[PDB]
Amino acid sequence: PVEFSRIVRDVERLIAVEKYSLQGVVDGDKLLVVGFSEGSVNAYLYDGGETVKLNREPINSVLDPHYGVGRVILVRDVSKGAEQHALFKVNTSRPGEEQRLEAVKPMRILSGVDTGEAVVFTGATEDRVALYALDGGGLRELARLPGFGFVSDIRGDLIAGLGFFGGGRVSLFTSNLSSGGLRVFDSGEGSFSSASISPGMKVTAGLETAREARLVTVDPRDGSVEDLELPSKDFSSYRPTAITWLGYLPDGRLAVVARREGRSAVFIDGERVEAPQGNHGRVVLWRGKLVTSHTSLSTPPRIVSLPSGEPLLEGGLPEDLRRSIAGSRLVWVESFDGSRVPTYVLESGRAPTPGPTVVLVHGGPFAEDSDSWDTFAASLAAAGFHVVMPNYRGSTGYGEEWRLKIIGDPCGGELEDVSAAARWARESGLASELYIMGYSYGGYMTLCALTMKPGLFKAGVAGASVVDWEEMYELSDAAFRNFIEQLTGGSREIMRSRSPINHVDRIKEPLALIHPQNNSRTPLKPLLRLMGELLARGKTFEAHIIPDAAINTMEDAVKILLPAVFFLATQRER
Amino acid sequence: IMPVEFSRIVRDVERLIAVEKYSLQGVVDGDKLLVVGFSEGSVNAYLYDGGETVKLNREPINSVLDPHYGVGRVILVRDVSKGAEQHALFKVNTSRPGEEQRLEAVKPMRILSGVDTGEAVVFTGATEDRVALYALDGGGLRELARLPGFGFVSDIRGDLIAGLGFFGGGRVSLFTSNLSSGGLRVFDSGEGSFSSASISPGMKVTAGLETAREARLVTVDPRDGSVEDLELPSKDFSSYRPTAITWLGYLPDGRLAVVARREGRSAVFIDGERVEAPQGNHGRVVLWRGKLVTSHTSLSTPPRIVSLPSGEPLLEGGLPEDLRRSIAGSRLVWVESFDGSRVPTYVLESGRAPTPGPTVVLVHGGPFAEDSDSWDTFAASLAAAGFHVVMPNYRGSTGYGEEWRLKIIGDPCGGELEDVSAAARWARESGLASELYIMGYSYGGYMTLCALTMKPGLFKAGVAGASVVDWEEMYELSDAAFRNFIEQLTGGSREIMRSRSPINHVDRIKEPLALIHPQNNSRTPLKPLLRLMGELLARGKTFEAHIIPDAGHAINTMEDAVKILLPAVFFLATQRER
Ligand SMILES: [Cl-]
Ligand SMILES: [Cl-]
Ligand code: NA
């Protein structure tokens, strides 16, 4: 019999677990960390195992402080949920005492950095996006940005940042604290991901390309770009495909966090440093040792010491729930056409081998399933399901060629990849029985598996799915028409034939629909129509139509996760 | 503004569904109690003897046919249509628990009732084209007679068959037939309706007759249709002044056992004489090992088997202390409605709510049914979750006389909604309710939708489960029994079918609505509800909807029970924190 309340307790514990990101070193040699729990963010000083809360009421984020600055700048939503913020200053000697920065009117704060004498940030208002500087003399507009943009770093007078300023690529920009202004350096082939300013006032930047990522040196004075060579070749040899973050430490060495194949690595002046498997945040030097944040499919975001991996600050899950979420791994599954599908697997401690396995299909489709904490995967593992997460073609993270392969072929190659994952799970010995579950494009993939690969999965969960492309091409807004057009090669024939609503007759397995009742980007009407067909043709289905369905709170979990875990737990007994 | 306590709610809901519940069906085999029980997460059939039960069935069942005393077998009734209520019958020999034979001579149909004599199975069923009375024996399956609407076999003695029928105007007639020659005979009272029947050693039919505001016992000679009052040797029964008769039957020693009731509590009589029984309601009475055994329930006591007069349980489920305290108390208040009619309304006060506090008007289904001092899993759940529960017997309700029951005929979503609305107002003006919600299943669901369309601003929010949405489309998709029933209820008027369907007044809804519906309900089907969803969306109304797979009206497993009840409680708890 299904242990409904046992599942609800677990989901609640996975939703509440505190998660940490590392922001910097501030005050008297103390770590600045931000903790989130259930959509509630706070900021702390951390030293020697205890933490002191800096803020009063919950915040949205903090700006990045320079090493040793005696204060922290809090960003807070100005109304319950609003998308406009206010800034507050807390002196690190006097935690919990907040001073509103009254010079800065409400606006959308996008990023920020605090040198200790000047707060430099970007912000979006009724009529524009601007880079701003705030100091003891007042607020100044440094520059109008031609789009959303973010401050990456300040050193002396030079400001560096990243902007979405056109071409669908991310550009580098610089400005100055003194005169303002804006120079923009274009990516060309690729897209810039990160930037820090070198002691020599050059901008070091991560350039993401169609293939391998690299570090470049940009001279703001003449716009010249050259490849930067590091003294150690660990970094070059790693062959990174992304560059998460980079920054110069106080002693002048360059710290870089770079990724490949769903996990990241930490380098100092090119030399790799041992780190726990998964993904890392920024790296700081603190009392002579390295510290970074770490997350994985089995570890909620936490602060750790390198190279030991020992956690400094970590949220507490109960012993038994912790045991249920076992290790994660990367396997490369062979799709029907020979292609190798990078697939992450989170094993359940509460399931045998072979055991019940869910193929949890990510959405997007232009997104990546990496080795990072995911509530849904964890909840499935908690509930006694092994979890298989395939980076079907269309995914990001594995080169442009792999992303572009979905184009013109929805419910084709990518479905074969999902299918190959299922089949690998069975053949490798992981799975006794298979389920499929996903949201957004994942939901679409669930409907395509159940109609075009009936008898592969024992049951499916489809959330926030698209059901008929042709209908949506006609209903929706300009940016979404464009997506559908790209995806289907502008073919109405493909639009109809890759729509699952046109194949309801083929479904042989129980289907659970979870769907928002008021979100104009996955509208309800088409889904009512599917339900009408399912009903007319005598299909087994469950449906949950709820208003106001993102997942951060328990309320959100209850609306869109719980029904899927319950349904699946219940089919497991079928 | 606190956060909803989801984990605490599901745990309470789970335990309240999971408590074992029993009902008494007969004495079979070598003096063993047949009981149908919800236990181990489903509805099953058990023999009780020697302080142990033996499970007769394998897969969950829906009910069993009434055995004659001592018969060497049980006939299981099971839905073989994933909830659409096409049932099939399965024989289990009582010496061989766990082994079923399907009675393949009976094609699936809606089984409404049945009696097993040991040599013949007599039952009533509804197909798409009719209700009928059947007999299955050594010679095969026989249609003894067609019935005009819902009909139920009550007893058989020798070849005399006796039963009750809803054959017009919401009245219940008595009917007889003959096991060998078949045929039908219908007996109507111009005074009221027959409520249960048993055949005397004499081959006359003793029945309850519920009149305007009182009930009595009558004898009906099946040879000439003459009716006369039955006097019993003891007058406790006549002095009890029952307003309704729950059940009656002749025991094997010739004595007449009668369970009758008033104001939502029942009392047990043997040959007219009171037998002490625990306060609440009772089911049939049987003779087991020399003594009397009945079932017993109350708003704080889940259905159990007790022996009489001691009232000591033979089988019962236990609730834990925390949950028992979640019910502070219960009482019957009489609410003045729109025409001066006094509406009997049960109130269950939560031990987890203040006064005034959050209150749910929980509208019973039927509509020929009642809120009484009987266990209600939904009411218990709501009290656990911190709502007081108000349970008004609107006109149409059983239990308070034929006049009150029949006033709903021809007037659905009329006077009975005013009664619900008067109960809502009472909850407020009396000081019980800080805020009001409405919730109901089946006809009660219909009432939620009618309150929300016709009486916007009365309730803060509504939960409509297994609800009626459109009488027209429902009628077209109904089998013979339900078509007849709908005709009766709407007074045969298509105008009423239309004007009293919520689907045609969606625009008026101003409050949030939770819809819960089992996909295969074959009484109130999903299709019209999908159309309501479409109308709610087109007109920008807030709602949520939950459609439960492979289930129908009758919930017979823990899982389905959780899926239909839990969204209700979660919804209402979320609404409370607006
Ligand atoms: Cl300036
Ligand atoms: Cl320039
Ligand atoms: Na400048």
Side-chain angles (χ1 to χ4, degrees), chain A residues 1-79 81-82 84-125 127-153 155-168 170-201 203-422 424-492 494-554 556-572 574, chain B residues 3-7 9-39 41-90 92-203 205-424 426-578:
Chain A
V2 180
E3 315 223 80
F4 290 101
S5 62
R6 168 151 166 242
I7 293 154
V8 178
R9 281 188 301 269
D10 284 344
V11 167
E12 175 179 59
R13 288 183 271 239
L14 298 169
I15 280 283
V17 65
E18 197 136 348
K19 312 153 192 162
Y20 298 97
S21 63
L22 176 65
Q23 304 301 305
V25 176
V26 303
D27 180 57
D29 206 22
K30 302 211 158 210
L31 294 191
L32 181 52
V33 308
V34 171
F36 357 176
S37 183
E38 274 204 282
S40 179
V41 183
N42 298 281
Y44 309 87
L45 298 173
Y46 169 86
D47 188 353
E50 202 48 81
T51 49
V52 172
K53 200 206 230 187
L54 277 158
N55 54 290
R56 277 164 147 315
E57 288 296 313
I59 68 188
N60 171 280
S61 52
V62 301
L63 307 185
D64 303 339
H66 272 23
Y67 276 78
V69 303
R71 73 191 183 177
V72 167
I73 309 293
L74 308 176
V75 181
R76 186 183 282 119
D77 299 331
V78 308
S79 94
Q84 301 210 106
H85 316 97
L87 302 181
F88 300 77
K89 158 182 71 224
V90 179
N91 186 255
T92 53
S93 298
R94 317 208 65 180
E97 299 206 353
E98 286 181 15
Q99 203 215 323
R100 192 177 170 152
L101 302 179
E102 301 259 274
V104 185
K105 73 182 172 165
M107 58 172 77
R108 193 182 159 178
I109 299 281
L110 293 175
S111 71
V113 162
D114 178 7
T115 64
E117 292 169 278
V119 182
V120 177
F121 61 103
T122 56
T125 85
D127 69 327
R128 72 211 198 178
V129 183
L131 173 75
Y132 287 100
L134 173 67
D135 65 25
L139 182 62
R140 291 172 304 122
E141 182 180 279
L142 300 186
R144 274 176 130 205
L145 306 191
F148 293 99
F150 310 79
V151 184
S152 295
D153 200 33
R155 188 196 286 267
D157 192 40
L158 181 57
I159 294 155
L162 297 167
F164 281 84
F165 296 163
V170 182
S171 284
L172 194 62
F173 72 79
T174 60
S175 195
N176 293 89
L177 183 49
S178 55
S179 52
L182 192 73
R183 182 152 196 184
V184 184
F185 316 78
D186 203 44
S187 317
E189 63 186 297
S191 190
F192 285 101
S193 72
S194 40
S196 194
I197 298 160
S198 78
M201 305 296 304
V203 181
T204 298
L207 180 66
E208 285 179 12
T209 67
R211 287 178 236 269
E212 268 167 49
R214 69 183 188 285
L215 290 180
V216 302
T217 292
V218 177
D219 190 340
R221 291 191 281 125
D222 67 15
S224 70
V225 188
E226 71 196 349
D227 298 343
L228 178 60
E229 313 293 7
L230 293 181
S232 179
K233 293 322 180 266
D234 287 356
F235 173 79
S236 173
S237 284
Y238 184 62
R239 289 165 36 203
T241 55
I243 300 194
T244 301
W245 178 88
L246 62 79
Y248 285 89
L249 307 177
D251 58 24
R253 297 180 286 173
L254 179 57
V256 180
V257 175
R259 355 189 257 286
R260 172 181 184 73
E261 290 179 3
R263 279 166 173 157
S264 63
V266 174
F267 307 81
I268 304 310
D269 277 346
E271 175 172 330
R272 193 172 166 180
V273 174
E274 186 138 31
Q277 290 192 332
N279 278 279
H280 313 100
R282 75 177 86 234
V283 175
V284 313
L285 186 69
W286 182 54
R287 292 178 185 164
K289 298 197 68 94
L290 299 161
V291 175
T292 188
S293 61
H294 166 249
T295 188
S296 82
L297 281 154
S298 61
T299 298
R302 66 189 181 155
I303 308 305
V304 301
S305 171
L306 303 181
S308 56
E310 184 63 34
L312 300 180
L313 243 191
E314 174 174 65
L317 294 165
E319 187 180 49
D320 88 324
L321 182 58
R322 252 182 227 292
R323 282 187 322 250
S324 70
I325 295 141
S328 77
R329 60 196 164 99
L330 179 57
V331 312
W332 297 81
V333 169
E334 209 189 21
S335 196
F336 157 73
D337 71 349
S339 304
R340 305 229 96 181
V341 184
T343 295
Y344 267 96
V345 178
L346 180 57
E347 276 173 40
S348 175
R350 287 165 174 171
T353 279
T357 300
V358 181
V359 181
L360 176 66
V361 177
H362 77 71
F366 302 140
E368 187 186 348
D369 263 333
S370 77
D371 186 19
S372 306
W373 183 251
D374 174 26
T375 301
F376 281 81
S379 293
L380 294 171
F385 294 96
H386 295 315
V387 189
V388 174
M389 290 153 277
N391 287 287
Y392 59 86
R393 78 195 56 198
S395 310
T396 55
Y398 293 92
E400 187 67 353
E401 178 180 298
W402 192 241
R403 187 186 77 76
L404 286 178
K405 273 184 145 61
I406 196 158
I407 296 301
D409 192 35
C411 187
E414 93 287 39
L415 173 66
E416 290 298 312
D417 293 337
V418 163
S419 184
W424 165 88
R426 189 181 288 295
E427 298 178 81
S428 74
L430 182 61
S432 51
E433 60 189 22
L434 291 149
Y435 298 94
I436 183 157
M437 159 171 169
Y439 300 87
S440 154
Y441 197 86
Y444 174 70
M445 280 297 321
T446 285
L447 294 173
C448 292
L450 262 41
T451 57
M452 295 312 284
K453 303 254 177 181
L456 180 56
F457 294 112
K458 200 180 154 185
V461 180
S465 53
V466 153
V467 117
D468 175 351
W469 291 117
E470 205 195 10
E471 182 163 40
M472 285 272 264
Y473 185 66
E474 232 82 27
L475 253 192
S476 61
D477 67 61
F480 203 33
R481 291 178 44 94
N482 188 259
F483 165 73
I484 297 168
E485 174 150 13
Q486 243 195 16
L487 193 66
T488 60
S491 177
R492 252 159 207 295
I494 280 165
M495 274 164 35
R496 280 176 281 228
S497 75
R498 315 295 178 81
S499 286
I501 204 145
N502 293 323
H503 298 294
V504 180
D505 83 293
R506 280 131 177 264
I507 300 175
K508 295 311 184 191
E509 281 93 64
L511 171 60
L513 304 165
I514 301 167
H515 212 82
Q517 91 98 181
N518 52 346
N519 170 332
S520 53
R521 297 191 66 72
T522 39
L524 189 57
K525 203 168 188 215
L527 189 75
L528 296 172
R529 188 159 62 89
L530 176 59
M531 284 176 221
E533 290 279 312
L534 286 173
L535 173 56
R537 302 169 189 274
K539 304 309 186 180
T540 297
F541 75 104
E542 183 160 338
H544 300 277
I545 284 74
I546 58 284
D548 291 323
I551 155 149
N552 292 121
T553 64
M554 186 47 185
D556 303 326
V558 165
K559 284 161 176 187
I560 97 190
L561 176 54
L562 235 45
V565 178
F566 281 8
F567 175 78
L568 283 177
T570 261
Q571 294 290 319
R572 187 165 56 192
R574 189 264 267 184
Chain B
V4 172
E5 308 224 83
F6 296 99
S7 302
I9 294 170
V10 62
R11 190 167 163 253
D12 294 342
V13 167
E14 228 179 348
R15 280 174 311 163
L16 291 171
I17 284 149
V19 291
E20 281 101 329
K21 309 164 184 80
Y22 300 101
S23 74
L24 182 56
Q25 299 309 317
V27 173
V28 85
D29 183 77
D31 216 22
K32 302 191 184 194
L33 288 186
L34 182 60
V35 304
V36 152
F38 178 83
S39 170
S42 28
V43 178
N44 301 299
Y46 308 87
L47 297 181
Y48 177 91
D49 194 42
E52 298 183 293
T53 53
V54 170
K55 182 184 188 198
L56 294 153
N57 68 304
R58 285 144 150 284
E59 302 308 320
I61 69 179
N62 284 103
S63 47
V64 303
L65 302 181
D66 295 342
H68 267 200
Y69 271 63
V71 300
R73 71 194 184 182
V74 177
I75 301 320
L76 306 180
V77 172
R78 186 186 285 121
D79 188 326
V80 298
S81 69
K82 291 161 167 172
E85 307 186 276
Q86 302 304 94
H87 315 91
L89 302 175
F90 303 76
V92 181
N93 174 212
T94 72
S95 308
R96 308 184 48 77
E99 306 252 355
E100 302 177 354
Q101 271 172 245
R102 190 163 170 163
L103 304 193
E104 297 271 359
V106 183
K107 67 180 282 158
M109 56 170 72
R110 198 195 291 276
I111 301 295
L112 303 162
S113 67
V115 161
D116 184 5
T117 81
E119 295 190 56
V121 172
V122 183
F123 59 100
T124 54
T127 65
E128 207 269 312
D129 81 301
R130 44 110 149 350
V131 192
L133 175 65
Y134 299 89
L136 163 62
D137 63 14
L141 166 73
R142 284 182 296 125
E143 190 177 298
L144 294 185
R146 281 164 127 279
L147 310 180
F150 278 108
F152 304 91
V153 180
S154 295
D155 209 27
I156 300 184
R157 195 196 277 272
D159 287 331
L160 186 60
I161 290 168
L164 301 171
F166 287 78
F167 300 164
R171 301 175 297 270
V172 196
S173 300
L174 182 56
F175 73 77
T176 64
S177 182
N178 184 278
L179 173 50
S180 302
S181 76
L184 184 79
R185 285 167 169 261
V186 173
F187 314 88
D188 284 320
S189 193
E191 266 199 88
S193 276
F194 300 95
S195 88
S196 51
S198 215
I199 315 185
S200 64
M203 295 299 261
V205 182
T206 303
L209 176 60
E210 294 172 351
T211 64
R213 314 197 181 90
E214 51 293 60
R216 62 177 202 275
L217 292 166
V218 301
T219 289
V220 182
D221 186 333
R223 300 181 269 116
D224 59 8
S226 65
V227 184
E228 68 168 17
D229 292 1
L230 182 56
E231 310 318 349
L232 294 179
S234 173
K235 304 303 168 174
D236 290 353
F237 176 83
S238 88
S239 304
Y240 175 68
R241 284 184 132 291
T243 64
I245 282 156
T246 299
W247 175 93
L248 62 70
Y250 285 100
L251 302 189
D253 59 28
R255 290 182 296 176
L256 185 65
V258 178
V259 173
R261 79 187 181 283
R262 56 192 266 109
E263 304 192 11
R265 292 176 176 169
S266 78
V268 173
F269 304 86
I270 296 302
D271 278 354
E273 187 178 357
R274 191 70 168 267
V275 175
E276 240 173 82
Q279 194 174 82
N281 281 268
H282 315 100
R284 77 191 82 208
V285 177
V286 305
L287 197 60
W288 181 64
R289 287 172 166 185
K291 31 154 170 161
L292 301 185
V293 172
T294 195
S295 78
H296 166 251
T297 182
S298 76
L299 278 152
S300 81
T301 302
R304 59 182 192 155
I305 305 316
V306 308
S307 89
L308 308 167
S310 65
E312 290 175 349
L314 287 174
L315 293 173
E316 66 178 7
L319 287 160
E321 191 62 18
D322 63 290
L323 273 168
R324 286 179 188 290
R325 301 219 197 122
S326 71
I327 293 172
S330 77
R331 50 185 172 118
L332 175 56
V333 301
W334 291 90
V335 175
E336 208 191 14
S337 198
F338 79 102
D339 62 343
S341 302
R342 282 195 328 156
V343 183
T345 312
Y346 266 86
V347 179
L348 197 57
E349 272 145 16
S350 166
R352 294 171 176 184
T355 307
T359 303
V360 179
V361 173
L362 177 64
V363 181
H364 73 73
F368 300 150
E370 94 195 57
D371 290 315
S372 72
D373 192 13
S374 292
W375 183 255
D376 185 317
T377 304
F378 289 174
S381 290
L382 297 174
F387 295 90
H388 305 300
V389 192
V390 177
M391 283 164 301
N393 292 282
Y394 54 82
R395 67 200 60 199
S397 289
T398 53
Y400 296 83
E402 180 91 328
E403 197 177 310
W404 196 240
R405 193 173 66 76
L406 295 188
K407 281 177 188 293
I408 202 169
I409 294 283
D411 194 36
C413 184
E416 94 280 47
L417 176 63
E418 297 297 321
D419 300 336
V420 172
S421 163
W426 169 88
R428 207 135 227 168
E429 291 159 30
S430 81
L432 182 62
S434 69
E435 53 183 350
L436 277 164
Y437 304 95
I438 189 165
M439 173 167 162
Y441 188 81
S442 197
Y443 199 80
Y446 175 64
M447 283 290 107
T448 286
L449 293 172
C450 292
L452 259 59
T453 46
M454 306 301 302
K455 296 218 182 264
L458 185 60
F459 300 102
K460 181 172 174 197
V463 180
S467 60
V468 179
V469 171
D470 184 16
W471 292 112
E472 300 203 79
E473 186 167 23
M474 185 170 123
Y475 184 91
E476 336 225 315
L477 295 179
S478 301
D479 72 28
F482 279 98
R483 281 192 313 275
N484 182 254
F485 194 65
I486 291 166
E487 290 168 44
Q488 286 192 50
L489 213 71
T490 62
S493 157
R494 171 138 333 247
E495 169 58 20
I496 293 279
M497 283 171 96
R498 197 178 341 94
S499 67
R500 311 306 179 84
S501 286
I503 200 70
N504 304 313
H505 306 293
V506 172
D507 233 39
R508 308 235 198 149
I509 300 182
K510 294 285 184 276
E511 279 88 58
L513 176 55
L515 308 176
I516 299 172
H517 212 100
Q519 73 167 133
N520 300 333
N521 196 315
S522 66
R523 303 190 189 187
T524 50
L526 186 70
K527 188 158 174 192
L529 195 98
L530 299 183
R531 187 161 72 103
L532 175 61
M533 291 183 227
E535 291 296 312
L536 286 162
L537 182 63
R539 288 173 213 274
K541 305 301 181 175
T542 310
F543 71 102
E544 60 179 72
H546 304 271
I547 304 192
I548 289 58
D550 289 348
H553 173 260
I555 298 298
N556 67 332
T557 66
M558 178 103 106
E559 295 133 311
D560 289 339
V562 172
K563 295 201 222 211
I564 75 156
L565 180 56
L566 199 57
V569 185
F570 274 9
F571 177 76
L572 285 168
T574 298
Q575 289 295 314
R576 181 170 51 192
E577 302 300 298
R578 284 207 294 131

